[PDB]
Amino acid sequence: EWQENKSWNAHFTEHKSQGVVVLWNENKQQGFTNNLKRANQAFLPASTFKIPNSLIALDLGVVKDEHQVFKWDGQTRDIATWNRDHNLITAMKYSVVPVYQEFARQIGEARMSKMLHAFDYGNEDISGVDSFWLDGGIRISATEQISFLRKLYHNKLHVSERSQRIVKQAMLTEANGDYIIRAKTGYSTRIEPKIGWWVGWVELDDNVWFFAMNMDMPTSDGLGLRQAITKEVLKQEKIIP
Amino acid sequence: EWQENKSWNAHFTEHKSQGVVVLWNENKQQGFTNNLKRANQAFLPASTFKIPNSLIALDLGVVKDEHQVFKWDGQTRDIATWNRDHNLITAMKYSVVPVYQEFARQIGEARMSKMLHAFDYGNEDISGNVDSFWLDGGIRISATEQISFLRKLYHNKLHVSERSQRIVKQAMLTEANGDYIIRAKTGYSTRIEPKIGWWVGWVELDDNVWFFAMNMDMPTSDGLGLRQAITKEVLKQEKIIP
Numbered sequence A: 001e002w003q004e005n006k007s008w009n010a011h012f013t014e015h016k017s018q019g020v021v022v023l024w025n026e027n028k029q030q031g032f033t034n035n036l037k038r039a040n041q042a043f044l045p046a047s048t049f050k051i052p053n054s055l056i057a058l059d060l061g062v063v064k065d066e067h068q069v070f071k072w073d074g075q076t077r078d079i080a081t082w083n084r085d086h087n088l089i090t091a092m093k094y095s096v097v098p099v100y101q102e103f104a105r106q107i108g109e110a111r112m113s114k115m116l117h118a119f120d121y122g123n124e125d126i127s128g129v130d131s132f133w134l135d136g137g138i139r140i141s142a143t144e145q146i147s148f149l150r151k152l153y154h155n156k157l158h159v160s161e162r163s164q165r166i167v168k169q170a171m172l173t174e175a176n177g178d179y180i181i182r183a184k185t186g187y188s189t190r191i192e193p194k195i196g197w198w199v200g201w202v203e204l205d206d207n208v209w210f211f212a213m214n215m216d217m218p219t220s221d222g223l224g225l226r227q228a229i230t231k232e233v234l235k236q237e238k239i240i241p
Numbered sequence B: 001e002w003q004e005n006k007s008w009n010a011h012f013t014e015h016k017s018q019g020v021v022v023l024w025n026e027n028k029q030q031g032f033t034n035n036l037k038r039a040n041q042a043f044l045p046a047s048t049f050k051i052p053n054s055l056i057a058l059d060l061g062v063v064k065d066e067h068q069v070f071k072w073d074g075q076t077r078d079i080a081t082w083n084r085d086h087n088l089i090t091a092m093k094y095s096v097v098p099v100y101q102e103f104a105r106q107i108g109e110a111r112m113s114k115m116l117h118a119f120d121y122g123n124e125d126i127s128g129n130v131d132s133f134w135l136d137g138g139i140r141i142s143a144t145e146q147i148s149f150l151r152k153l154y155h156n157k158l159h160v161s162e163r164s165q166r167i168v169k170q171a172m173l174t175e176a177n178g179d180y181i182i183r184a185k186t187g188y189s190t191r192i193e194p195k196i197g198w199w200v201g202w203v204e205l206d207d208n209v210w211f212f213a214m215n216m217d218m219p220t221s222d223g224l225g226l227r228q229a230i231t232k233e234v235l236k237q238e239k240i241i242p
């Protein structure tokens, strides 16, 4: 069912970095990783939390839809792309923390807690309300990411079908005549080790490949590798050209 | 509100072809074409019919969802990609006529008629084969009537369930990167003259939506690449994509 493929370590090594890639071939009901232990190591979700955050916000009417505008509170921050108005689409695309802090506040630790349980999301621990996924108690592994994503793909999370379709739309990262990628980036720097995340899936004509990957991210220089390494692995297994 | 930009004719000319591109800047409530007359000229919709077809099928339970498999009736056809099983996603991606003929048959001329009226879709004329009228029958739609229909689909304003619309928009997904998302549908009409290519859909940006309808003379199947290439060359020029 699960199989180690240590040959993928080469892809981490050649960029002088450590980390895990987990693939799941949906049709064959089989999974593949370069490191079974790290694949099961839990980390802070960072901006990958914006998936379940988005879903809970939508199901509760905190977000009416994906066109609804979230007004810049007018305070400049370090990320240029955060200093302007956003909708759920641009909120996810640009990982706009303040917008999701604001959703989290309206959602409320009571309901957020209930929902993460119902989702079976990582360790279901909200030790913090407006920061817990950045610097608090919540932890999720690569394989628990796949598990959550697989439920989102088949509209099996304990929220309305609409809420899921909207979040999957919002996850749209890349598409052409070969594949569709739906995914969410993450960068956790508050608690060591500093890691990059890329979780989502590859839609083909006739199969779906789910992916969760995290890698050591000591410096923000490496961030390009989250996508590049996952893709190098997807190329190798002839999932994309 | 509407503005002629004859400079775009260059893009048709340079490939020795005639045709129209219609843009609509949603935010500014303004439209742009290389030819106001042709922009209003109606043609057979061809595979662009798969949008309203998909919507009606979904709203009526002919299609349960986008994963549901449509089993190849086992008869080899000219188009390699048609000779295998399909779901609403691959059905749209590869313009699989037989699948949509089959939906049309189940939908039934009575309901298909009512729905195209409610949609205000082109000339609302289904007359011909229930299973062929959008290929060789009576239905006619212009570039501008395409935008109108598309604009309603974008805001989930067609008199069909929101779900049905979301699914068809998903299925329209053609292209996406960190700059833009294109949702669109191709068409090739060769049964009745004049032979034309279609590309209708829209470009999603961070803060705006550009709707596009384009058709061009398509005497030979050699030109088909130009449907996307000319639209893109125009989208480049107006600095909508890089």
Ligand SMILES: *C(=O)[C@@H](NC(=O)c1c(-c2ccccc2)noc1C)[C@@H]1N[C@@H](C(=O)O)C(C)(C)S1
Binding pocket: A046, A047, A048, A079, A094, A095, A097, A133, A134, A135, A185, A186, A187, A188, A189, A190, A220, A223
């Ligand atoms: C999500 O991961 C976003 N970042 C955080 O939530 C976050 C950061 C951060 C890193 C760099 C700049 C600003 C904040 N540190 O800890 C956390 C929990 C997005 N990650 C970054 C990325 O490049 O992927 C950004 C710039 C998109 S914000």
Ligand SMILES: *C(=O)[C@@H](NC(=O)c1c(-c2ccccc2)noc1C)[C@@H]1N[C@@H](C(=O)O)C(C)(C)S1
Binding pocket: B045, B046, B047, B048, B078, B079, B094, B095, B096, B097, B134, B135, B136, B186, B187, B188, B189, B190, B191, B224
């Ligand atoms: C949709 O328009 C499809 N074509 C037709 O429905 C169609 C054709 C046709 C032309 C060439 C090959 C097969 C069918 N002739 O009249 C009609 C109404 C799709 N058009 C083609 C394209 O290249 O866009 C295909 C191959 C995608 S089928």
Ligand SMILES: [Cl-]
Binding pocket: A168, A169, A172, B169, B170, B173
């Ligand atoms: Cl989508």
